[PDB]
Design a protein around this ligand. Sequence first.
Ligand SMILES: [Cl-]
Ligand SMILES: [Cl-]
Lengths: 128, 128
Amino acid sequence: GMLPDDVNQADVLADVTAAFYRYEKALTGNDVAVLDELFWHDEKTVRYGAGENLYGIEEIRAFRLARPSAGLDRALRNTVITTYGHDMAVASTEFTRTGSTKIGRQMQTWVKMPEGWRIVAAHVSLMS
Amino acid sequence: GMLPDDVNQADVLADVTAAFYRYEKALTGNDVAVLDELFWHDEKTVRYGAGENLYGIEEIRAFRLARPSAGLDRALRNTVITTYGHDMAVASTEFTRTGSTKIGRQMQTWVKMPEGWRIVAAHVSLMS
Ligand SMILES: [Cl-]
Ligand SMILES: [Cl-]
């Protein structure tokens, strides 16, 4: 049960936030090692990206290596990080790019595993 | 703390799965009252839809009433529902519609509140 006071406990929110910005940096720099580190290592993990639907860490890894590295840098905007209790978080952000005209959105659900905070599901898309 | 045994406990998953399909019913039948009941009533709630970025339950409610009621029906595909401990879940699915050629994706993060299972963040989009 999630009680109202259990939302956004300062310390939980600091850990998750650092983790989020660390993922942000790995993503824009194409640090595939870390991008793999931060994702949950399981067959149930899901990543819906702009042009692909990926199920399991195996497919997400294939994706990562097959992905073009040019124009990965992006500016975030309207970022909302909300924690629930001591081991669950939702990071939501919009983003834009120097090249594009469309607006990007990214939603990620983080869970604290024994190995650390891990993204168990992510959806990334361009707004119509 | 989330150990491997805390993933997909039978009872928790049975509940969240039923809540997920209740929402599916409300969405396709445009049961705005239920659609609202099932979303978390808070300013922090976030819904990224195909063509809009909604922040807070008030913005989400406006959207429900402004939305066209025609063609809301859909077919689900590749649905994955994973629960974490006894009070968080992530439901992800693809979907298609009779008319369209594009593939839809929905991802929802559910938290069990005292009033019940509630979607705290949702992202819907068409694969580009
Ligand atoms: Cl896998
Ligand atoms: Cl609000």
